[PDB]
Curated annotation (Swiss-Prot):
E64 binds at residue 25. Its EC number is 3.4.22.14. It is an enzyme of class 3 (hydrolase). Repressed by the active-site-directed cysteine protease inhibitor E64 (L-trans-epoxysuccinyl-leucylamide-(4-guanido)-butane) produced by Aspergillus japonicus. The gene is ACT1A. Keywords: Allergen, Disulfide bond, Hydrolase, Protease, Signal, Thiol protease, Zymogen. The active site is at 25, 162, 182. The keyword Transcription regulation does not apply. Fruit. Cysteine protease responsible for the cleavage of kiwellin into kissper and KiTH. It comes from Actinidia chinensis var. chinensis (Chinese soft-hair kiwi). This is Actinidain.
Amino acid sequence: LPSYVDWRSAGAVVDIKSQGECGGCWAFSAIATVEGINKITSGSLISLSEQELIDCGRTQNTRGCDGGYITDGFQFIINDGGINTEENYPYTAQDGDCDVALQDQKYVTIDTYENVPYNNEWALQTAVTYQPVSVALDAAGDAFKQYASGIFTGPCGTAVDHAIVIVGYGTEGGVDYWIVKNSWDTTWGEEGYMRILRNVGGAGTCGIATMPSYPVKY
Ligand SMILES: [N+]
């Protein structure tokens, strides 16, 4: 595998978004990876609707702004036969009525999704080499909330509660890192992104390797 991977350099990452107070990061993350795979496969980068997942994708324990799971985001897209764009069904940071006319308007599709073997940074690295990957990490501590720059090393636990997207990896000064796209606007981290310590074992830094998944588009 390569020593550096950055999906931004390949035109496969939409500009940073901001989720506000709604706890819909599960949607932010699933959408970011679907945007990525769509670019890779079709050659065109389109910003997709997190709002549609929040409003129309409620299922089991995935309940809009109340929280949910990345995989239920992928499953919504699969079961619906597609997803609409950010421009057509814009984000409001609220739990709303699913707009069915907009739900029926489908521009991008995926075929299935896969889970990366949990707690295995090598398997995660391999997956990131081919496409952006969705992950969840423990973002509850102030160190995470306060992050402004550098390769973050913690402190943080491994009981995940915030979904984000890995868009690459690299090494600098002998220190391996993952490049993470967050949905907290460009005013958090390095213009909206974070570099976080890689190859630490087990669940990874802040549990970043404990529950990865990615969409598949043949
Ligand atoms: N849709």
